Write a protein that binds this ligand. Sequence first.
Ligand SMILES: [Zn+2]
Ligand SMILES: [Zn+2]
Ligand SMILES: [Zn+2]
Ligand SMILES: [Zn+2]
Lengths: 529, 72, 186, 187, 585
Amino acid sequence: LTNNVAFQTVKPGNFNKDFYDFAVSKGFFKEGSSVELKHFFFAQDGNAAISDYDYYRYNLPTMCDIRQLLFVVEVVDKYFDCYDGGCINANQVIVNNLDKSAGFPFNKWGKARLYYDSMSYEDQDALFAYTKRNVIPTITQMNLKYAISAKNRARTVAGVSICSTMTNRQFHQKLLKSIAATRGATVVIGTSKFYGGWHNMLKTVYSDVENPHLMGWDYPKCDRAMPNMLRIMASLVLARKHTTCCSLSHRFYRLANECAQVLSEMVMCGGSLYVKPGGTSSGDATTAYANSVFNICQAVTANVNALLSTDGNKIADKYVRNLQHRLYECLYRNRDVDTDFVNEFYAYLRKHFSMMILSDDAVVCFNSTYASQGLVASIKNFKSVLYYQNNVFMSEAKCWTETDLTKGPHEFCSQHTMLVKQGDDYVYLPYPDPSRILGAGCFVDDIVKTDGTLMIERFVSLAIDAYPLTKHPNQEYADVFHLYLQYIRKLHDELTGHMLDMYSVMLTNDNTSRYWEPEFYEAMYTPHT
Amino acid sequence: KMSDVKCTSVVLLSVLQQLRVESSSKLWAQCVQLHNDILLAKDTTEAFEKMVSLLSVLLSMQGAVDINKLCE
Amino acid sequence: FSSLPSYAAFATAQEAYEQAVANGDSEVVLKKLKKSLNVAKSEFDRDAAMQRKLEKMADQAMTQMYKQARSEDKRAKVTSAMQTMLFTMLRKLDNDALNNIINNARDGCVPLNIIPLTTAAKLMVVIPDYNTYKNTCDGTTFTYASALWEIQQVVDADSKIVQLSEISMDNSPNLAWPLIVTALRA
Amino acid sequence: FSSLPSYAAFATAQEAYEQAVANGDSEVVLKKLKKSLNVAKSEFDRDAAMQRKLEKMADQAMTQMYKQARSEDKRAKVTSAMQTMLFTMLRKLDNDALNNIINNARDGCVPLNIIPLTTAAKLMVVIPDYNTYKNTCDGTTFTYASALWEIQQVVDADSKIVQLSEISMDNSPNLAWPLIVTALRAN
Amino acid sequence: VGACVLCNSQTSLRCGACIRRPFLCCKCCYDHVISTSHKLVLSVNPYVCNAPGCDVTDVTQLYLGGMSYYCKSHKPPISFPLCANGQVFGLYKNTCVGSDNVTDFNAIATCDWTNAGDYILANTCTERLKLFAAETLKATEETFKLSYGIATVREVLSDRELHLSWEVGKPRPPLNRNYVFTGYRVTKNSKVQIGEYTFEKGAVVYRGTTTYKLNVGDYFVLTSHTVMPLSAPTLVPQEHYVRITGLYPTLNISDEFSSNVANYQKVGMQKYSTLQGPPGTGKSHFAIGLALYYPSARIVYTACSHAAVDALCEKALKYLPIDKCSRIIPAVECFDKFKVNSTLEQYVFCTVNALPETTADIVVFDEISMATNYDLSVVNARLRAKHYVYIGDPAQLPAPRTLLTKGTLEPEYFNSVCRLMKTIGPDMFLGTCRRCPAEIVDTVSALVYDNKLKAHKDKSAQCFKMFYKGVITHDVSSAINRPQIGVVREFLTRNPAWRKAVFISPYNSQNAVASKILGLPTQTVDSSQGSEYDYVIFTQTTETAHSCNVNRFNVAITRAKVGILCIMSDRDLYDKLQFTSLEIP
RNA sequence: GCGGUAGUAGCAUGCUAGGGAGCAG
RNA sequence: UGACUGCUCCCUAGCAUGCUACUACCG
Ligand SMILES: [Zn+2]
Ligand SMILES: [Zn+2]
Ligand SMILES: [Zn+2]
Ligand SMILES: [Zn+2]
């Protein structure tokens, strides 16, 4: 588009010398300490956005087992059954952070606020109905992510145009809000980890598993290697709720808009257009939920492959053997949906392979004695399914397995789980990697966050995220939260001191003495919202 | 010590970015590589060598007054 | 609280009520000054709570103005603040190679390129006078970054290549002294 | 607030209160006086609750009207900007070859990926290393996309004009390397 | 967030309705708001109702609300007036000093800079107020000169002949060299290097020192510059030490003057030393004598033009070696005859138009009289030293007035420091006269110089006076007098030996008319320094008091080398001059 | 001497809007 | 140049609900 290529770099993080000095004053970052800085704002050179966009080379044209995929779709739809969705009018659309960028070229003139203010509800409704019988290809701007991470690889997020995002909101937001309003479901998007929500999630995962083990896996290059068939399946499953609001032509044209906007659109990496081969444009209005249905599809495919790639003569249980027989029947013999067996297999999966699904992050409480017998995907069925249906090799070193349920999932949503005894009962608290919180305190992305006095609530939120470290058996982990409390106290005391130097008096009524106290943060993880 | 040298690498790359080092693609790429390798380093010898290499970039320019900034 | 006419009226009403109760009064005469006391108390507890809110909001607004001013002064002095922080942390590191290169850049030679860490690549420095030349160079060896660099070529500021054993105390002031010594790591 | 009929009623009530205090009237007269002022306070309570609410509602409506007017002004500005962008990018289309390929289509419809590949008067090649440079942009003119391209300018990631003589095996590490060579269509 | 202007107190409040947004503490900012129409004050964010679609800016109507400032019609229930208790709300609302003296600020803020009262208040106020007044005066001048459009020239004519028009209703700008047009010509997109021009009566004739080229489509306009704030006052605090320690006494002195080193040594130890020296008359000799006596003191030379200081430059090489002479030009161009590529030097040359960052030990404020408080503050702030000496005399030169309409500047009230300089008299003597004889020295000494100047030689009776009446008739801003030119021709015709001088006239019209008969160039008397010749002739034409002041032409009065004629159209110089009257036909 | 109905204001709860910030995928 | 979604804290503003507070109307 321009006469010269635009090389976008990623700046290094802005140091927080005050917080780092306070931490080392409290005996942190000692030579050999179990807690060390591992998360940093890794900088990137000019040819980094295009280098990360080239990771779409891992997106290959993948032909799926169609007779198997058509059954996995039914099982995933059974997973997405308790929710409700459909078209909503422009007046019923909820948009958080209207001051976010609006793709290309709409970012030249303003944020999404301009295009949600310049378009009346009738204008947005006309645009959304236009996509029900037309296709609007859109330009997706590839933006370098400027955030703290433990990996030096450049992170990129897809900036989808306001034309695509606005219509995808009106098409999917009802279902998405229903998904992020349901508790005790397989997809835990919208379920808070605070106020006992993490414990509720984990207890729902341990629903009725007879021989429970915890198993989480990893999708390598998930947003880059997801086959276009699986992304289309995700969009169709999300479109399964439009039985009444949309005609078949309307649903197909909405799917075509999805594919032309977030699957094979024109990417604007740098200052020039490119063709996206496929995969998840992980900036679309359904990124988390499409990744969730993709994850459920991969898990169901792994379970189906485990059942079918099992010696049925050696399957001692007469129910599981018949289930495998009818599974083969419904895959390659039955042509129409066998809703009876779809429900039966969905119930079998819920009983023996209960899942906790977010956007490509998952924890499964699976029947260990079944996965040992190949009646449920243990980890190798996941590896094989990724190999032949995702064009990646799932390394088993990126896949944990916890055989004891008293200690929860090894890692879910980058949060570890430990069973703490708050009140009089035992609950599971999500504690993060202490290096992550320490780096967030020490490395910040604006210079104004280099003095905490400016944003004390930032460290309040970090201590909220770091409170469950207090119960950790390792003292340095608890020392992280204690250090954050002491630093919050120091910040408040220096803010009051600076204000006193600017006045002839000081603030008398504070009520801020709860920020450097464990009571304010303990209530954040107790089941009383 | 290791955390100290990593944080010094962070602040050094910050001052380099403030000095329009990114205007030189080769120099900025080398600085980014050194900064990212210091943060990924596990020993305080390789990290310190890369820190010396990165600081040589700052000392190679006339945009920063080295005598004035050494107030001790 | 006690700096308003409402407080004066409330105090007068309270004193009158207390005096009437202690001295002894009938139901009607006491109820009169109690109805005249409750109105004053309502007008004073509202006024002082409004004053409490005003004091808290004014302190919060001055705190917010201080935050914005500090943000602007840190975002406008960031170039100097980051450099000062970097040099303080560098002198805190007390690393021999870092201290050596920092002192050289302060007083004498500065690198002309990124100093390498491999034992094959070369280094170019800018020695401006004989003091640093004698302190750093000794024969064919050049001490820099706490490492031994093998001198390979010395060129003055006029692009004039000169030999090694030719610059000494007495013969120093006859060549362009901002020279560029090229050396290789040992 | 300052022009309501209740003000005169309050003034009359205060005058009657002063007259009763000075004269020392009976309890019935005082009660009747209180029933007047106190229910004139009832009338003014409404004038300070419904009228004050109407004033707040009017201020809110005026604020909403200001926001809507600003939104319409932003809509007009964005409409003009988008229209001018479309009109100033259409003028660079070189509609000669564009019509040559459009009219050559089966029904005037062509894929988008071929319009720059057939009717673009300028080609920009981004090259990561000399090994790919010698293969693609060799010499002052090269062939790509079934067409002949002649180089008019070569720049590096620093956007510095670098001559063709500088693209050498030995001179490669002395150049920033995403080299961006810009060429013009030959004929 | 800085110190207050009128009170020197920390504050984050800028008076928005003012021009330069001065820093005002809460109490004084409130005083400025209530005593004038400056109802707008700024902060970290401007004091304005942040409710959308509101247009109140008055701090009185503005009340602190939530996280922003609102008005009575848009305030939350928790409302807090910004300006209350005698101070406007803001930072340092408790650590405040204030000042009862706010009348001067309120008066000067609303003034149009068209009355003499503004000048009087600027000359008589606090130093911070004086600097603020100078900055606002410059801002008003540059906003009034930029208050018009772009003068478009559509045709090209012969050399020194251009028909330049004005805007619709725009008055005639000053045709003299008072305003030097410095624009930037646009070829197609970018405005760069129009060149340097100087408008003069021809009909505009330009005198370019160096060659220049003109593009096609360029236009001539007066682009304004960036009015920087002011930091240093006119004078620095004064102190005298006790003993001479830490210096380097040299053994070489100038033997021509034997009664000046004993006070130059004190100047080297005292802060201020005022001398009664007319420009270019023994003034350059003092600097050379100090340089010879004190080569270890760092002296910086500044001038308003290179042409006037060219005489100093030509004699510096004949008096001092080339090696010590240096010119650190800010690297909009000049000659390069001085040393190049040498940062470390004792004596450095520059110009007051572009004074780079520097530091010295002895400062010679050359032409300190013709510089207003804005110029004096710019030099005092952009340059700092350890010892500061102010070389100049109050009775040297008045500042030119641009927007003044009523009132004449008093000769004694040029500056506030100059008022103190002339109170006790000079403490040094310069009894070496290498200049004009007692014909003019004695006359000026008995008039203004307090009869202190030295008369070594006698009066050669080489000065003459003529009495005439003349007729006053304005055309645009001047007058043309045929009989005066006829008398000049009748005098010069019988004695053509005096027709070898460059005529200097306060009004350019006379020389412009006479250029067709004699061909002499037109040189203004205000900046005629640096050009000296044997024969000199003076003419002031009119008899008004605003032009015939005590000492305005003193720059060219002492530029004579053998004697200068005096044609006084007023009656004041008839009684003051002790010369002999001569007949005039 | 009566139940108040009402009312309108300190106090509490909630719902919404606006701003600042933190974590997660 | 600054994506989509989710959860949590802090400040302010206005509005719905539980009180509290007093004047008198009405029987
Ligand atoms: Zn629909
Ligand atoms: Zn003040
Ligand atoms: Zn003002
Ligand atoms: Zn308002």
